[PDB]
Each structure stands twice: as structure tokens, then as C-alpha cells.
Amino acid sequence: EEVRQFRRLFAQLAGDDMEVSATELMNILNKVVTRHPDLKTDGFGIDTCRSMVAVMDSDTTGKLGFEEFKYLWNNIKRWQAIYKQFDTDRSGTICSSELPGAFEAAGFHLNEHLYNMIIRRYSDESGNMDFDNFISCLVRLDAMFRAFKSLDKDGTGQIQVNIQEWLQLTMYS
Amino acid sequence: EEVRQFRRLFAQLAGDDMEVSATELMNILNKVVTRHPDLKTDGFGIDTCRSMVAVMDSDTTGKLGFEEFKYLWNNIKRWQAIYKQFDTDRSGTICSSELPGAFEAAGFHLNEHLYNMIIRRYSDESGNMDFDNFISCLVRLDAMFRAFKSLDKDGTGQIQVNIQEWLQLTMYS
Numbered sequence: 001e002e003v004r005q006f007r008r009l010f011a012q013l014a015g016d017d018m019e020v021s022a023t024e025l026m027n028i029l030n031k032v033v034t035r036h037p038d039l040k041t042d043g044f045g046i047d048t049c050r051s052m053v054a055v056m057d058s059d060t061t062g063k064l065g066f067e068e069f070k071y072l073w074n075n076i077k078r079w080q081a082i083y084k085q086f087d088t089d090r091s092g093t094i095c096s097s098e099l100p101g102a103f104e105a106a107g108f109h110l111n112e113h114l115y116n117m118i119i120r121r122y123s124d125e126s127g128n129m130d131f132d133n134f135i136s137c138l139v140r141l142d143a144m145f146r147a148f149k150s151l152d153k154d155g156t157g158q159i160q161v162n163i164q165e166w167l168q169l170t171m172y173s
Numbered sequence: 174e175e176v177r178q179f180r181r182l183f184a185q186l187a188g189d190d191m192e193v194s195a196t197e198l199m200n201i202l203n204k205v206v207t208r209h210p211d212l213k214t215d216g217f218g219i220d221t222c223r224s225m226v227a228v229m230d231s232d233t234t235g236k237l238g239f240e241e242f243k244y245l246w247n248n249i250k251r252w253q254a255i256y257k258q259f260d261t262d263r264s265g266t267i268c269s270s271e272l273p274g275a276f277e278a279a280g281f282h283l284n285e286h287l288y289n290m291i292i293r294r295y296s297d298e299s300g301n302m303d304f305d306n307f308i309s310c311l312v313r314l315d316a317m318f319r320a321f322k323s324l325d326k327d328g329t330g331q332i333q334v335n336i337q338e339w340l341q342l343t344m345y346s
């Protein structure tokens with residue numbers, strides 16, 4: 001019944017326009033995090049969810065269709081399990097000492113410099129990251145690796161991006 | 174006096190660490206918009222302000238020093254003026270039809286496709302944009318032009334980046 005239950009979840013969440021908006025996404029994430037007192041969060045806010053939608057909206061409809069939403073949801077299901085596992089003291093938050101192992105478990109092997117930038121952008125003044133910040137960072141990180149991979153057809157590890165493409169990739173994010 | 178008053182504003186806003194954080198920025202922007210009822214807004218949120226700080230934080234300290242803050246504030250001043258001037262129907266919001274005129278006044282000449290993305294990302298279902306979303310969009314857009322230019326000295330309209338560079342550019346934003 002897994003396929004069936006999920007199609008049902010998408011149908012009811014997407015509603016009358018058959019796609020998942022930022023508001024719909026915000027609502028479901030917040031509902032689910034209500035049941036997980038181990039995930040400390042101030043909530044998923046609408047601007048975070050608009051960025052989430054835009055980076056996952058690869059056909060540029062403004063909203064998440066079934067396959068887009070399925071990809072996002074399955075990544076979050078995995079990433080939440082990682083966050084719980086790497087929260088090796090039950091603060092409910094991922095501190096700087098815990099972050100590299102968490103990201104590496106998700107398949108993101110970054111260097112100290114990158115980890116440092118991520119912490120400045122997504123963690124608080126103590127270096128702790130809450131759950132909605134952790135998911136919004138990973139959704140973006142995954143999308144940016146995928147964008148790079150899409151543009152590096154020749155597998156040279158360098159991509160050439162023109163201004164139109166630069167603006168599209170950065171503004172619709 | 175302008176010079177003197179502004180130093181006082183920065184000093185009081187930045188407080189004990191001598192730089193302006195995202196929280197401090199959020200608090201001043203919200204205090205200031207409330208005195209401009211001709212600028213409609215649901216408020217500036219913390220995630221939006223973290224994004225604003227990141228794109229304005231040229232020396233990667235995590236927070237805005239005096240010249241970074243001055244740059245941002247002077248832009249906001251100019252853009253709020255444009256907002257009021259191009260809200261021709263006096264709605265307090267900038268609709269899809271008013272947007273190009275506003276953006277052209279701010280010096281940006283974008284193609285249809287990129288307006289469509291911007292409206293999807295920043296406007297409401299009707300295509301109307303409130304003031305915090307307009308400012309957030311402009312801050313970002315100005316920054317993204319500046320970043321590309323700083324990397325494309327000889328105006329080829331293309332930059333070349335490796336994965337490390339790409340992630341630094343896209344995740345610290």
C-alpha cells in the first residue's frame with residue numbers, strides 16, 4: 001500500500017490545482033514536525049518554503065507536481081533520520097561538531113571552508129542549526145549539486161554559465 | 174549632519190559586536206516599515222533577513238559592517254522611493270503590470286522569462302508584490318549582478334566555476 005498511500009497523500013495535499021504550493025508544503029511539514037518532539041524548530045516559514053518550491057520546481061509551473069513532490073518528500077524522510085541520528089546529545093539541534101558527519105551521511109562531502117559558510121548562513125550564534133534550517137540547507141545543497149551536474153555535460157568539473165542562466169538559477173531559488 | 178546621524182544609527186543598531194546581524198536588521202526594518210503605511214507588508218522575516226545579510230556580507234564575517242550596511246541602507250532608501258512612485262494605483266503593492274517600470278527605474282532590464290520566474294517567486298497569486306518581498310528581490314538581484322561582474326571582468330557574459338566555487342556562490346546567499 002506504500003504507492004497507494006502516497007498518491008493519496010499527494011492528492012489531498014495538492015488539492016484543486018493538482019500541485020503543491022509553498023503554503024501547502026509549509027503546512028504539511030509543520031503538521032508532521034508536530035509529532036516529532038526530538039526535532040527542535042521554530043517552524044517552517046513561508047519564505048523558506050517558497051525557496052524550497054522554487055529549487056525543486058524544475059518545470060517552472062510555480063508549484064510541485066507529483067514527481068517533484070515525491071523527490072522532495074523522499075529526501076526529507078531520509079534527512080530527518082540523519083538529523084536524529086547525528087544529534088548525538090539530544091539538543092534537538094545539529095551543532096558544528098555534529099554537522100559534517102550529518103552532511104556526509106547524506107552524501108555531501110564538503111570541505112571545512114564550505115562547512116564554515118553553511119554554519120554562518122544556517123546556524124545560530126552558538127553554531128546550532130534547527131531542523132527547518134537543516135532541511136532548507138540540504139534541499140538547496142542537493143539542488144545546487146544537481147544544477148552543477150546538469151551543466152557539466154562533459155564531466156570536466158568546470159561549468160560555463162552565462163548571465164541569463166546565472167540570474168535564472170539564483171533568482172528562482 | 175546626514176553622515177553624523179547615520180554613524181549614530183549604525184552604532185546603536187550594531188551594538189556590542191560592532192556589526193549588524195540578521196536579527197538586528199529584521200528588527201530595524203520592521204520598526205521602520207510600521208511608520209510607512211503606504212508600504213504594505215506582512216513583516217520582514219528572519220530567513221529573509223539572513224539571506225539579505227549573506228548577499229551583502231562581502232567579507233564573510235557573517236554580519237554587516239559599516240560600509241556593508243551603508244550600501245544596503247542607501248539602496249533600500251532609493252528602492253522604497255521607486256516603490257511609492259511606481260505603485261500608480263496607490264494599492265501599497267506592486268503588481269505584475271507595475272513591476273517592469275519599477276525595475277527599469279532601479280536600472281534592471283530583464284527578459285519576460287526572468288520576470289515570470291521573479292513573479293512566481295516573489296509575488297502573490299494575483300501577481301502583486303508587497304514591500305518586504307520587493308526589497309528582498311532587489312537586494313538579491315543587485316547582488317547577483319555584482320557577483321557575476323566581479324567574476325567576469327572582461328564582459329564575456331560568461332563565468333567558469335568549479336564545484337567549490339559554485340557552492341560558495343550559491344549556498345552563501
Ligand SMILES: O=C(O)/C(S)=C/c1c[nH]c2cc(Br)ccc12
Pocket residue numbers: 029030032033036076077080
Ligand atoms: O520518524 C519517522 O518514521 C518518519 S517516516 C519521519 C518523517 C517522514 N517525513 C517527515 C517529515 C518531517 Br518535516 C519530519 C519527519 C518526517
Ligand SMILES: O=C(O)/C(S)=C/c1c[nH]c2cc(Br)ccc12
Pocket residue numbers: 202203205206209249250253
Ligand atoms: O521616505 C523617506 O524619506 C525615507 S528616509 C525612507 C526610508 C529610508 N529607509 C527606509 C527603510 C524602510 Br524598511 C522604509 C523606508 C525607508
Ligand SMILES: [Ca+2]
Pocket residue numbers: 013014015016017018019020021024
Ligand atoms: Ca494546490
Ligand SMILES: [Ca+2]
Pocket residue numbers: 057058059060061062063064065068
Ligand atoms: Ca512544477
Ligand SMILES: [Ca+2]
Pocket residue numbers: 086087088089090091092093094095098
Ligand atoms: Ca545536537
Ligand SMILES: [Ca+2]
Pocket residue numbers: 041042043130131132133
Ligand atoms: Ca529555524
Ligand SMILES: [Ca+2]
Pocket residue numbers: 186187188189190191192193194197
Ligand atoms: Ca550586533
Ligand SMILES: [Ca+2]
Pocket residue numbers: 229230231232233234235236237238241
Ligand atoms: Ca561583513
Ligand SMILES: [Ca+2]
Pocket residue numbers: 259260261262263264265266267268271
Ligand atoms: Ca500597485
Ligand SMILES: [Ca+2]
Pocket residue numbers: 214215216303304305306
Ligand atoms: Ca512579504
